[PDB]
Amino acid sequence: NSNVVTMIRAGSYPKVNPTPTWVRAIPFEVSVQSGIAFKVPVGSLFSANFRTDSFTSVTVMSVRAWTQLTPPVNEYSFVRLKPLFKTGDSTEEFEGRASNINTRASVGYRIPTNLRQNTVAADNVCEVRSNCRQVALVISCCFN
Partner RNA sequence: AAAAAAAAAA
The residues that touch Na ion, with contacts defined as CB under 5 A, are: 48, 51, 53-54
Task: Give me the least distance between CB of 5 and RNA, in Å please.
Answer: 8
Distance CA 131, CA 96 (A): 12
**Length in residues, the chain:** 144
Is residue 20 a contact point for RNA (CB under 7 A)?
A: yes
Q: Taking the mean position of all CA atoms in its chain, how far away is CA 101?
A: 26
Among 12, 17, 74, 114, binds RNA (CB under 7 A): 17
| Per-residue CA distances from 68 to 14, 20, 106, 113 (Å) | 47, 33, 10, 30
Site for its own copies in 40-99 (CB under 8 A): 48-51, 53-59, 61-62, 64-66, 68-70, 74-76, 83, 85-99
Is residue 70 a contact point for RNA (CB under 7 A)?
A: no
What one-letter code names the amino acid at 21?
T
3-state secondary structure of 22: strand
DSSP state of 119: B
Stretch binding RNA (CB under 7 A), from 22-30, 69-77, 82-90, 128-136:
22-30
DSSP H/E element including 112? none
Site for RNA in 27-66 (CB under 7 A): 61-62
Task: Give me the least distance between CB of 81 and RNA, in Å please.
Answer: 13
Q: Which residues bind RNA (CB under 7 A)?
A: 1-4, 6-8, 14, 16-17, 20-25, 61-62, 138, 140, 142
